[PDB]
């Protein structure tokens, strides 16, 4: 009974890719209409420090409870699994916020990576929310994405172990079968295909209703996402789901939002798109 988001807000670090105006749309998003009236909000790429410390105390207020951000440091946290490194150019850019008591959160690094995201701290962030005293749990991610420059289809076997860690995490937590288990975030795997298929038996996970826009990076009607690719061909990349084997809510469904900011200004080029990411909500119905 959550009322989810998960936004994958592309804060790219600030020192090595400075022009895409994190911290100007830090602002946006915490002065958007999507990011209130949720329970939980899950965060995605908010690599930047800077941009994503803004980010996080604009929402400070209404998601009181914050975890740190996935793979930046060792403090802040219950528990620190995987192969996490100090040594490593990049964090996980996995945060997840509140309106309710955090009573536990642990973050895992992936073991394996490709590419850019193998010189990063990707893997999820496990959190053990109490909402009138009862207890919820919920896991946020992000996975190996497309690398033009990595192996052959070794993103997507990589994508597989990385699903599988997440849902031998939770097999392993003894998690009461009456509690339900979230899952979302950028799985950067396209709705409707054979790896979809795949990925749903992976993360041990049933599927959704889908809402609202059938595109989660769309180049047709996003300004940044446009401008990266202006080719085209229009993803879904963005879920939240439930493990099938604990308690599953009523209607659970991923709502696309299309919510836009006021036009803004990096260096006199205009965009008006919160990331090149829309944001999905989650909810019962």
């Not at 795997?189 to 795949?198: A, H, Q």
């Not at 300004?223 to 963005?238: C, M, Q, T, V």
Request: with cysteine; net charge neutral.
């Amino acid at each position: 009974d959550l009322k989810l988001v998960s936004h994958n807000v592309y804060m790219l670090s600030t020192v090595l890719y400075p022009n895409w105006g994190q911290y100007k749309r830090a602002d946006l998003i915490g002065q958007s209409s999507y990011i209130k009236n949720n329970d939980v909000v899950i965060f995605n790429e908010a690599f930047d420090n800077g941009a994503s410390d803004k980010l996080l105390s604009n929402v400070k207020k209404e998601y009181p409870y914050q975890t740190p951000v996935l793979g930046r440091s060792q403090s802040g946290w219950d528990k620190t699994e995987g192969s996490y490194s100090s040594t490593v150019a990049e964090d996980g850019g996995v945060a997840i916020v509140s309106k309710y008591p955090i009573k536990e959160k642990i973050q895992h690094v992936f073991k394996s990576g490709c590419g850019f995201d193998n010189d990063s701290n990707k893997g999820f962030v496990y959190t053990k929310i109490e909402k009138n005293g009862k207890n919820v749990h919920v896991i946020g991610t992000h996975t190996q994405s497309e690398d033009s420059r990595c192996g052959a289809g070794h993103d997507r076997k990589i994508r597989a172990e990385q699903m599988k860690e997440i849902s031998d995490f939770v097999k392993k937590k003894n998690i009461p079968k009456d509690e339900t288990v979230y899952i979302g975030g950028d799985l950067n795997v396209n709705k409707g295909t054979p790896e979809f298929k795949d990925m749903l038996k992976n993360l041990n996970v049933n599927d959704v209703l889908y809402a609202g826009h059938n595109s989660t990076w769309d180049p047709q009607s996003n300004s940044i996402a446009k401008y990266n690719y202006p080719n085209g061909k229009p993803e879904h990349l963005d879920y939240i789901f439930t493990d099938k084997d604990h308690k599953q809510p009523k209607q659970l469904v991923n709502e696309v939002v299309t919510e836009k900011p006021k036009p803004w200004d990096v260096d006199g080029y205009v965009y008006n798109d919160f990331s090149d990411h829309y944001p999905i909500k989650a909810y019962s119905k």
